[PDB]
Design a protein around this ligand. Sequence first.
Ligand code: FMN
Ligand code: FMN
Lengths: 104, 105
Amino acid sequence: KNFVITDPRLPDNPIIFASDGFLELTEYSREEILGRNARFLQGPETDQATVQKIRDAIRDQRETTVQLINYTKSGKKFWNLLHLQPVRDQKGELQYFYGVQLDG
Amino acid sequence: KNFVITDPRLPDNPIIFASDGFLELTEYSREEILGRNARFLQGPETDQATVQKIRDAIRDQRETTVQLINYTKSGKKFWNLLHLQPVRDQKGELQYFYGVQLDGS
Ligand SMILES: Cc1cc2nc3c(=O)[nH]c(=O)nc-3n(C[C@H](O)[C@H](O)[C@H](O)COP(=O)(O)O)c2cc1C
Ligand SMILES: Cc1cc2nc3c(=O)[nH]c(=O)nc-3n(C[C@H](O)[C@H](O)[C@H](O)COP(=O)(O)O)c2cc1C
């Protein structure tokens, strides 16, 4: 399926893992996206209000589900039904976020 | 939904990441399973022939999809539709495996 993992402890919360499904969805290769913040999928018609909700969820370190317009590598639009989830270590400190993406 | 990631560069290919869905499916906690090979989900009625296929796929470092009986922590049986996928680094060396579990109901 389609999922990624980011490290919020790294500069700009970059993707450190992406499934093959994510690669197929976005048309990007693994080498092209590792180490980058997932926001590169956003564009002109992406709703900023929804991005803010994502930003608030990340700050508050809570799970969230939103729906927003993303763009493929070739410039094709798709609605991304995005589910985010924080992962904590054994000491209860924030360690990762994981996201599950769905093409509408 | 349900997925894990293992590290084949570590002894016994242990789980190093698990989604909340995986935790809910198997009734195990995150601390309980990190650092362990995923084989603990197998039990009495698990078909060894299927286990052998998985082992072959991991050896060959290719993706595979099987269905097999697994067990929750409490011992409840469930059909696991399991998909495995190898992941390589930029130099082409095997770096991870990821697995996706679907409950067959
Ligand atoms: C694990 C994870 C996966 C994400 N996946 C996407 C995505 O697929 N598409 C998208 O537009 N934003 C995604 N985001 C959100 C962006 O990375 C970023 O956090 C969001 O645009 C708000 O941050 P910003 O205001 O600094 O851009 C994801 C975030 C996380 C933590
Ligand atoms: C990423 C990954 C996920 C796996 N998930 C499961 C699983 O959910 N259930 C299961 O019975 N085996 C699963 N396995 C297979 C076992 O970890 C192990 O490879 C299999 O039992 C064969 O090894 P063995 O014959 O030495 O026990 C998974 C393997 C990998 C690499």
